[PDB]
Design a protein around this ligand. Structure first.
Ligand SMILES: *[C@@H]1O[C@H](CO)[C@@H](O[C@@H]2O[C@H](CO)[C@@H](O[C@@H]3O[C@H](CO)[C@@H](O[C@@H]4O[C@H](CO)[C@@H](O)[C@H](O)[C@H]4NC(C)=O)[C@H](O)[C@H]3NC(C)=O)[C@H](O)[C@H]2NC(C)=O)[C@H](O)[C@H]1NC(C)=O
Ligand code: 3PE
Ligand SMILES: *[C@@H]1O[C@H](CO)[C@@H](O[C@@H]2O[C@H](CO)[C@@H](O[C@@H]3O[C@H](CO)[C@@H](O)[C@H](O)[C@H]3NC(C)=O)[C@H](O)[C@H]2NC(C)=O)[C@H](O)[C@H]1NC(C)=O
Ligand SMILES: *[C@@H]1O[C@H](CO)[C@@H](O[C@@H]2O[C@H](CO)[C@@H](O)[C@H](O)[C@H]2NC(C)=O)[C@H](O)[C@H]1NC(C)=O
Ligand SMILES: *[C@@H]1O[C@H](CO)[C@@H](O[C@@H]2O[C@H](CO)[C@@H](O)[C@H](O)[C@H]2NC(C)=O)[C@H](O)[C@H]1NC(C)=O
Ligand SMILES: *[C@@H]1O[C@H](CO)[C@@H](O[C@@H]2O[C@H](CO)[C@@H](O)[C@H](O)[C@H]2NC(C)=O)[C@H](O)[C@H]1NC(C)=O
Ligand code: CLR
Ligand code: NAG
Ligand code: NAG
Ligand code: CA
Ligand code: CA
Ligand code: CA
Lengths: 756, 48, 96, 136, 48, 48
C-alpha cells in the first residue's frame, strides 16, 4: 500500500498509445555490434598500413648524413621544460597546447612529439638521422587525424629508442623517466612471434656475490618481456639440473606464473661445480615436452652464466643438429673467465651473445634478443605485416584502458636494385595506434536493455575486452607484502561466477562459433553481498575480421523494451515542468541519470548541477533538436510524466503513514523520486538507474526484496533512514512482458520494533 | 690513457655525453656523463 | 674514555632506519655532532668500519691502538671521536 | 552478518542447508597493507519449516526457523544463546585478503586457449653471421 | 690464499685487493708490507 | 685552515701522511669561498 505497485501498472496501461513495445532481437543486436567493432578496427588498421608504407619509403630514400651543423633537425622533445628561456644539430620547437576533452591532457595538433629515453643521448649520429628521416611522418599523422578525427595516438616506436606520437603532448609529469618504447608490450608483440623460452641459470659456486644479484635481476627483467602468448620455464644447474619452481614443463607467461617464477628465482643460492652437459640436456628435454600446451614455435634457450671452459659439442650434435633451437648466452657480472665457449654456443646455434657487467646494462641487454627473433619475419616480405591487437592495458599518458594495433616496419634500402640484404633483416620499428575501450563501449549501446543485460568480448586467451566487471585498475597478483605497466588481463571466468555451462560457452567463443544458450545461472549482486538465481540467455558471434568474439547477455524479461512516442510540443512542456528544481516539493526530490543525451550537455558528478543543466537545456530551443538522442530524451520525459502522475495522484493523498519513512521510485529512463523532500538527503543510491543494486536484485525476483542496511558506516544507519524493501513493477502489454520500474519504501525501525 | 667516463659503459669521449642512470640502493638517480682525467696521471714529465 | 661511544647515529625519527648511506657518530648535545631536523640520536648502531674499529674490550682497544701506531687511519678515529664528544680534548689522546 | 553475531547458529544453518555459500575471487581490489576472497550466502532448499536441535559443548540449543513466502525473509527462533556454550569461531562474510588459487594446481589443469597459428621462426635465407662475439 | 680464498666475493663486489690468484695475492701482500691501507684489507679479511 | 690550531692539525695529519695528496688537490684554484669570506664567486684556493 505505501509504495504504489498496482497504481504504476494501471498507469502504464491507462497511458498507453504514448509508447510502443519494440523487440530486442539478440541475434541482430550482436551482429550489428560485431560489424561496428569490425569497421572501427579496420579504420584503425588502414592508418597503420599507410604509416608503415610511408615510413618504409621515406627511410629507403634517406641519405645517411654524419654531420649536422647548428639547426638541422627541428623537433619537439617531449621532456623539455616549456619555459627555459635560453642542440648540437637540433632546434627545439615551442608548441602551443590548447586543450582537448577527448584526451584530457593539453595537446598540439600542429606537429609530433619525440620521446628519447634518459640513457640515449639525443646528439648521436644514429639519433639525429632518425630525427631527420622520421620527420616525414608528421604529414601522414595529420592526414590520418583529418580523415578520422577520432584517432587517439599514433606512435612510431623506433629500434633506436625514440618514439614519435602525433598529438604533441608533454611527457607524463624522484620522477625519473624509465620508459623505453622497445620494452612496451605492443612493441614486443609487433617485433617478433610467440616464443618457447627456457631460461637456464648457472648457480655454481663461482657466481656467488654480485654476479648472483645481477643474474636474478636480469632474469626478472627478461621475464618482464613476455606476453600471454609466450611460454616460459626457468631451470638452474650447479651439478645436477633442477627446476627453480614447482612448475615442471612450461607455463604461459601470465601475470601470476611470472610472479611465481620471479619469487623462486629471488631465492636461489650458489654452490657447486658447473656441469654444462647436464643443464643443456635438461633444457633440450623440456623443450621437447609436447604433452603440455605451448606456443609451438620460436624454441630458444637463454643461458645466464659468467664464464667457463666447456663448450659441450656432443650435446648440441645430439639434441640440436638440424638447428631448430636458438641459444642466447649471457656473460653476467664483472669477472675474468674464459668467454670463448659461451660465444661459440651462440655462434653455432643461430643465437647471440650478450654481456651484463652492471645493473645499468640489464635493460638493454635483456631487450635485444627480439632483434634476432625478427629476422625470419623480415625475410617473409609482405606477409608478416598483419595488424595485431594487444591486451587491455593502462595507457602511458593517463588515457585509461586502451588496446594497441601494431604493424612492423621493415628496412628496404637497396631493394629496388639488388644491393643490400645483410642488415636489411632488421625491423626499423613498430607502428601503433591506440583505441580506447570507451570507443568499443560506445559502439555497444546498453540503454535498450534492462539493467541486468550487458555485452562482453573475449579474445583467444579468454580474457575480457569488454565487461561490466572490468575496472581501470591493475590486476592483483597476490597478498600484498608488507613494506601501471602490467596488462589488465582478466579472464571471463574470473570476471563472473564460474559455471559448468559457462566453461563451455567460453570455449565455443574462443573457437570462433556463434549460438544461443538459455539456462538457469547464478548471478551476483552489484553490492557484492547477495546472490540471485536468474535465468539468462547468452547469444554470441565472432567479430569477423579479428580474433575477438562478442556476446550479449539478456534475461527472459528483457526481450522487449518501451519506445517513447514523438507526442507533441504540448506534452513535452507539461512533462518537463515536473522536474523543475523548485518543483520537487509537491512532486518529491528528483534525480536524473548522467547519460549523454546531447553532445553539448556535460556530465557532472553532482546531480544538482547536471539536473540544472538538463533543465536549462530543455528550456532552450526544443526538446527535439539535432546533436541529441531523440529516443533517450523522449524516454526520460515519458518516465518523468508517469512518475509525476503516480506521485501526485497517489502519494499526495496520504502525506504521512505510520510505518514508513520514505517512498521512492526508480525507473529505467533515469529518474529517481523520493516523496519526502527531507528524505532526499538520505538517498545514498547511485543516480544512474542502471547501477542500483536493489533495482537489479528486484528485477530477478517476482516478490518483495528486503535490502539490508549497512553496518558501522559514516552515513546514517538504520535509525534515521530506515530499512529498504523494493518490489519490481511488472506490466503486461499485449502478450509482452516488461519490467520498467521498481518502487519501494524505507520502513522505520521504531514502528516495526514496536510491532514485533 | 688516464681518461675515464663517469658512466662505466661509455669508453670514448663522443659516447660520454648526455645523462645516465646511477643505481644506488633502492633509488635511481640521473647524472650527467663527463669525460674527465684522473687526479694523478702521466701526461708530461712534470705531471709524472 | 671511549668505551661504547660510537654506537649512536642519526636514525630517522619515524623508523629505526639509518638516515644516509654513510653514517657518522652523533650526539644529543651541542659540542657533539647534532642530527638534522628529520632525525634523532638513537641508541644502537654497529659503528665505524662495520664495528671493527672501536674501544669496547681491552682486546678491541689494543687492536685499535696498534692501528694508530702504524699511522694508518688514525685521523678517522680523531674525527669520529670529535663527533661523539667534541674536539676540545680528543687531540690530547691521539697526538701523544 | 549473523555469523559475526552468533557464530554457531550460523554455521549450523549452513550445515543443515538453511543457507548456502559460493565463494569467488576478486583480482581488481585494493588492500591497506591485491587478490581478495569474497563470500555470498543464499537460500538453497527454498522450503519453509526449518526446525532442529543445535548441539553446543555439553549442552543442547533447540531452534526453529520459518521463512516468509512473499519476501526473502527468514524467522529463526533459537532457544537461548547464553544457556549452552558453543565455540565462538566467527564466520565472517566480509571480503578477506588472500593469495589467489595455487598456480601449481591451475597449471596442472590449464584453461582452454587457442594460440596464434602464424609464426615466422626459421628461414633458409637468414644470415647467422651476426653472432655478437666478433662484433665486440 | 689458504685463509682468504674465494671469500672476497662480497655482494657489492670483489675488492681489487683479493687473494683469489697468486699474482693478486703477491700484490696484496706487497701492499701490506708497505703499510698503505693495510687496515682496509684487514677489514675485508675480517668481513669475509 | 680556518684557525691556527686547525691549521696545525692539518700539517700534522699531512706529516703522518694521511691522504695529504687529496688535501693538496682540495686546496687548488676554483673552489667555492666562504659565505662571509667577502668573495661572492668561486675564486678561492691557489696553484701554490
Ligand atoms: C637500413 O639498412 C641500410 C643498409 O642496409 C642502412 O644504411 C647504412 O647505414 C650505415 C650506418 O650504420 C652506413 O654506414 C657507413 O659505413 C661506414 C664504414 O663503416 C661508416 O663510417 C664509419 O664506420 C665505423 C664502423 O665501420 C663507425 O665507427 C662509424 O659508422 C663511422 N666512423 C667514422 C669515424 O666515420 C659510416 O657510418 C657510413 N658511411 C657513410 C659514408 O655514411 C651505411 O653507409 C648505410 N648504407 C647505405 C647503403 O646507405 C640503414 O642504416 C638501415 N636503417 C637503419 C634505421 O639503421
Ligand atoms: C705551537 C707552535 C707549533 C708547535 C708544533 C710542534 C710539533 C707540531 C705538532 C702539532 C700538534 C697539533 C696541535 C693541535 C692543536 C689542537 C688541534 C685542534 O684540533 O684543536 C681543537 C680544539 C678546538 O679549538 P678550535 O678548533 O681551534 O676552535 C674552537 C672550535 N672550532 O682546539 C683547542 O681547544 C686546543 C687549544 C690548545 C691547543 C694547544 C695548547
Ligand atoms: C634530412 O635532412 C636533409 C637536410 O636538412 C633534408 O634535405 C633538405 O631538404 C630541403 C627541404 O627543406 C631541401 O631544400 C630544397 O631543395 C630543393 C631541391 O629540389 C631546392 O630547390 C632547394 O635547395 C630547396 N628548396 C626550397 C623551396 O626550400 C634541401 O635541398 C635538402 N637537402 C640538403 C639541405 O642537403 C631532408 O628533407 C631531411 N629528411 C626528411 C625526411 O625530412
Ligand atoms: C607424456 O610425455 C611422455 C614423455 O615426455 C610420454 O612418454 C610415455 O610415458 C608413459 C608414462 O608411463 C609411458 O607410456 C611411456 O614411458 C612413454 N611412452 C612412449 C614414449 O611411447 C607420454 O606418452 C606422454 N603422455 C601421454 C598421455 O601421451
Ligand atoms: C563473417 O563471415 C560470415 C560468412 O563469411 C558471415 O556469416 C554469414 O551471414 C549471412 C547472413 O548475414 C549468412 O547467410 C551466411 O550463411 C553466413 N555464413 C556463414 C555462417 O558461414 C558473418 O556475418 C561474418 N561476420 C560478421 C561479424 O558479420
Ligand atoms: C556455487 O553455488 C552453487 C549453488 O548452490 C553450488 O552448486 C550446488 O552445490 C551443492 C553442494 O554445495 C550441490 O548439492 C548442488 O547440486 C549444486 N548445484 C548445481 C546446480 O550444480 C556450488 O557448489 C557453489 N560453488 C561453486 C564453486 O560452484
Ligand atoms: C718559492 C716559490 C714562491 C717559487 C715557486 C713559484 C711557482 C712554483 C708558484 C709560486 C706562486 C705561484 C702562483 C701564485 C698565484 C697564482 C694565481 C692562480 O690563480 C694561478 C696560478 C698562479 C699564477 C701561481 C702559479 C704557480 C706559482 C708561480
Ligand atoms: C570508418 O571511417 C569512415 C571514414 O574514415 C567513417 O565515415 C566511418 O564512420 C568509420 N566507421 C567507424 C568509426 O566505425
Ligand atoms: C629545525 O629545527 C630547528 C631547531 O629549533 C627549528 O628552529 C626549525 O624550525 C626546524 N625546521 C623545520 C623545518 O621544522
Ligand atoms: Ca662455475
Ligand atoms: Ca697512510
Ligand atoms: Ca705511510
Amino acid at each position: 500500500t505505501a509504495s504504489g505497485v498496482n497504481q504504476l501498472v494501471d498507469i502504464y496501461e491507462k497511458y498507453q498509445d504514448l509508447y510502443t513495445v519494440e523487440p530486442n532481437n539478440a541475434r541482430q543486436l550482436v551482429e550489428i555490434a560485431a560489424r561496428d567493432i569490425e569497421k572501427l578496427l579496420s579504420n584503425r588498421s588502414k592508418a597503420l598500413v599507410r604509416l608503415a608504407l610511408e615510413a618504409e619509403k621515406v627511410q629507403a630514400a634517406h641519405q645517411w648524413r654524419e654531420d649536422f651543423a647548428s639547426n638541422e633537425v627541428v623537433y619537439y622533445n617531449a621532456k623539455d621544460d616549456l619555459d627555459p628561456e635560453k642542440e648540437p644539430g637540433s632546434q627545439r620547437i615551442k608548441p602551443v597546447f590548447i586543450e582537448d576533452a577527448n584526451f584530457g591532457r593539453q595537446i598540439s595538433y600542429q606537429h609530433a612529439a619525440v620521446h628519447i629515453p634518459t640513457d640515449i643521448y639525443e646528439g648521436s649520429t644514429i639519433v639525429l638521422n632518425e630525427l631527420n628521416w622520421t620527420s616525414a611522418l608528421d604529414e601522414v599523422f595529420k592526414k590520418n587525424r583529418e580523415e578520422d578525427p577520432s584517432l587517439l595516438w599514433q606512435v612510431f616506436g623506433s629500434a633506436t629508442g625514440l618514439a614519435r606520437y602525433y598529438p604533441a603532448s608533454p611527457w607524463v609529469d624522484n620522477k625519473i623517466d624509465l620508459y623505453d618504447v622497445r620494452r612496451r608490450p605492443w612493441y614486443i608483440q609487433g617485433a617478433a612471434s610467440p616464443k618457447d623460452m627456457l631460461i637456464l641459470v648457472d648457480v655454481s659456486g663461482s657466481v656467488s656475490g654480485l654476479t648472483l644479484k645481477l643474474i636474478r635481476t636480469s632474469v626478472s627483467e627478461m621475464l618482464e618481456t613476455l606476453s600471454d602468448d609466450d611460454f616460459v620455464n626457468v631451470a638452474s644447474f650447479n651439478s645436477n639440473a633442477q627446476d627453480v619452481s614447482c612448475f615442471q614443463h612450461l607455463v604461459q607467461a601470465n601475470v601470476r606464473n611470472k610472479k611465481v617464477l620471479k619469487d623462486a628465482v629471488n631465492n636461489i643460492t650458489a654452490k657447486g661445480i658447473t656441469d654444462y652437459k647436464k643443464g643443456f640436456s635438461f633444457a633440450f628435454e623440456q623443450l621437447l615436452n609436447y604433452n603440455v600446451s605451448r606456443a609451438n614455435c620460436n624454441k630458444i634457450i637463454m643461458l645466464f652464466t659468467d664464464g667457463g671452459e666447456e663448450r659441450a659439442q656432443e650435446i648440441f650434435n645430439k639434441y640440436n643438429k638440424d638447428k631448430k633451437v636458438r641459444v642466447f648466452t649471457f656473460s653476467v657480472g664483472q669477472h675474468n673467465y674464459d668467454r670463448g665457449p659461451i660465444q661459440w654456443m651462440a655462434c653455432e646455434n643461430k643465437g647471440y651473445y650478450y654481456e651484463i657487467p652492471s645493473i645499468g646494462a640489464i635493460r638493454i641487454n635483456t631487450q635485444e634478443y627480439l632483434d634476432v627473433l625478427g629476422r625470419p619475419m623480415v625475410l617473409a616480405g609482405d606477409k608478416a605485416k598483419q595488424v595485431q591487437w594487444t591486451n587491455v592495458y593502462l595507457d602511458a599518458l593517463e588515457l585509461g584502458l586502451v588496446i594497441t594495433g601494431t604493424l612492423p616496419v621493415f628496412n628496404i634500402t637497396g631493394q629496388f636494385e639488388n644491393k643490400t640484404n645483410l642488415k636489411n633483416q632488421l625491423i626499423l620499428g613498430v607502428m601503433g595506434v591506440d583505441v580506447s575501450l570507451e570507443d568499443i563501449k560506445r559502439l555497444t549501446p546498453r540503454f535498450t536493455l534492462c539493467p541486468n543485460g550487458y555485452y562482453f568480448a573475449i579474445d583467444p586467451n579468454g580474457y575480457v575486452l569488454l565487461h561490466p566487471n572490468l575496472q581501470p585498475k591493475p590486476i592483483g597478483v597476490g597478498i600484498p607484502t608488507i613494506n601501471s605497466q602490467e596488462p589488465v588481463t582478466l579472464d571471463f571466468l574470473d570476471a563472473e561466477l564460474e559455471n559448468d555451462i559457462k566453461v563451455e560457452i567460453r570455449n565455443k567463443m574462443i573457437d570462433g562459433e556463434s549460438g544461443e544458450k538459455t539456462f538457469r545461472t547464478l548471478v551476483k549482486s552489484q553490492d557484492e553481498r547477495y546472490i540471485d538465481k536468474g535465468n539468462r540467455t547468452y547469444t554470441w558471434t565472432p567479430v569477423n575480421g579479428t580474433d575477438y568474439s562478442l556476446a550479449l547477455v539478456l534475461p527472459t524479461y528483457s526481450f522487449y523494451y518501451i519506445k517513447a512516442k514523438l507526442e507533441e510540443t504540448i506534452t513535452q512542456a507539461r512533462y518537463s515542468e515536473t522536474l523543475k528544481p523548485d518543483n520537487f516539493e509537491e512532486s518529491g526530490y528528483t534525480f536524473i541519470a548522467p547519460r549523454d543525451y546531447c553532445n553539448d550537455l556535460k556530465i557532472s558528478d553532482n546531480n544538482t548541477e547536471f539536473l540544472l543543466n538538463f533543465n536549462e537545456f530543455i528550456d532552450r530551443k526544443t526538446p527535439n533538436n539535432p546533436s541529441c538522442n531523440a529516443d533517450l530524451i523522449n524516454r526520460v520525459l515519458l518516465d518523468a510524466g508517469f512518475t509525476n502522475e503516480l506521485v501526485q495522484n497517489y502519494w499526495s493523498k496520504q502525506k504521512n503513514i505510520k510505518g514508513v519513512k520514505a517512498r521512492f521510485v526508480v525507473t529505467d529512463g533515469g529518474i529517481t523520486r523520493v516523496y519526502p523532500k527531507e528524505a532526499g538527503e538520505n538517498w545514498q543510491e547511485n543516480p544512474e538507474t542502471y547501477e542500483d543494486s536493489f533495482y537489479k536484485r528486484s528485477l530477478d525476483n517476482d516478490n518483495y526484496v528486503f535490502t539490508a542496511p549497512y553496518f558501522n558506516k559514516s552515513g546514517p544507519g538504520a535509525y534515521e533512514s530506515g530499512i529498504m524493501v523494493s518490489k519490481a513493477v511488472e506490466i503486461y502489454i499485449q502478450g509482452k512482458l516488461l519490467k520498467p520500474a521498481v518502487v519501494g519504501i524505507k520502513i522505520d525501525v521504531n514502528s516495526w520494533i514496536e510491532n514485533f | 690513457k688516464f681518461f675515464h667516463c663517469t658512466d662505466e659503459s661509455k669508453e670514448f669521449e663522443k659516447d660520454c655525453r648526455g645523462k645516465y642512470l646511477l643505481y644506488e640502493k633502492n633509488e635511481v638517480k640521473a647524472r650527467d656523463r663527463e669525460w674527465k682525467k684522473y687526479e694523478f696521471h702521466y701526461d708530461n714529465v712534470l705531471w709524472a | 674514555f671511549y668505551m661504547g661511544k660510537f654506537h649512536t647515529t642519526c636514525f630517522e625519527e619515524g623508523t629505526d632506519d639509518i638516515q644516509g648511506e654513510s653514517p657518522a657518530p652523533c650526539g644529543t648535545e651541542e659540542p657533539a655532532r647534532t642530527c638534522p631536523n628529520g632525525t634523532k640520536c638513537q641508541p644502537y648502531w654497529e659503528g665505524p668500519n662495520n664495528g671493527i674499529t672501536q674501544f669496547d674490550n681491552i682486546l678491541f682497544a689494543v687492536l685499535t691502538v696498534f692501528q694508530c701506531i702504524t699511522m694508518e687511519g688514525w685521523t678517522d678515529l680523531l674525527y669520529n671521536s670529535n663527533d661523539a664528544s667534541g674536539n676540545t680534548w680528543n687531540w690530547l689522546y691521539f697526538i701523544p | 552478518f549473523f555469523g559475526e553475531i552468533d557464530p554457531s547458529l550460523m554455521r549450523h544453518l549452513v550445515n543443515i542447508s538453511v543457507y548456502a555459500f559460493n565463494k569467488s575471487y576478486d583480482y581488481q581490489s585494493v588492500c591497506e597493507p591485491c587478490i581478495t576472497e569474497q563470500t555470498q550466502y543464499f537460500f538453497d532448499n527454498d522450503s519453509k519449516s526449518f526446525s532442529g536441535v543445535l548441539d553446543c559443548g555439553n549442552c543442547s540449543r533447540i531452534f526453529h526457523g520459518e521463512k516468509l513466502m512473499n519476501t526473502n525473509l527468514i524467522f529463526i527462533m533459537v532457544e537461548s544463546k547464553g544457556t549452552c556454550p558453543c565455540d565462538t569461531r566467527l564466520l565472517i562474510q566480509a571480503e578477506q585478503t588472500s593469495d589467489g588459487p595455487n598456480p601449481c594446481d591451475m597449471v596442472k589443469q590449464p584453461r582452454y586457449r587457442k594460440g596464434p597459428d602464424v609464426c615466422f621462426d626459421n628461414n633458409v635465407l637468414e644470415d647467422y653471421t651476426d653472432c655478437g662475439g666478433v662484433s665486440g | 690464499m689458504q685463509l682468504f680464498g674465494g671469500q672476497f666475493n662480497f655482494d657489492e663486489g670483489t675488492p681489487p685487493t683479493n687473494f683469489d690468484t697468486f699474482p693478486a695475492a703477491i700484490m696484496t701482500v706487497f701492499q701490506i708490507l708497505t703499510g698503505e691501507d693495510w687496515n682496509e684489507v684487514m677489514y675485508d679479511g675480517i668481513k669475509s | 685552515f680556518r684557525t691556527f690550531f686547525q691549521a696545525l692539525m692539518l700539517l700534522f695529519r699531512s706529516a703522518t701522511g694521511e691522504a695529504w695528496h687529496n688535501i693538496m688537490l682540495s686546496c687548488l684554484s676554483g673552489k667555492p669561498c666562504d659565505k662571509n669570506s667577502g668573495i661572492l664567486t668561486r675564486e678561492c684556493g691557489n696553484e701554490f
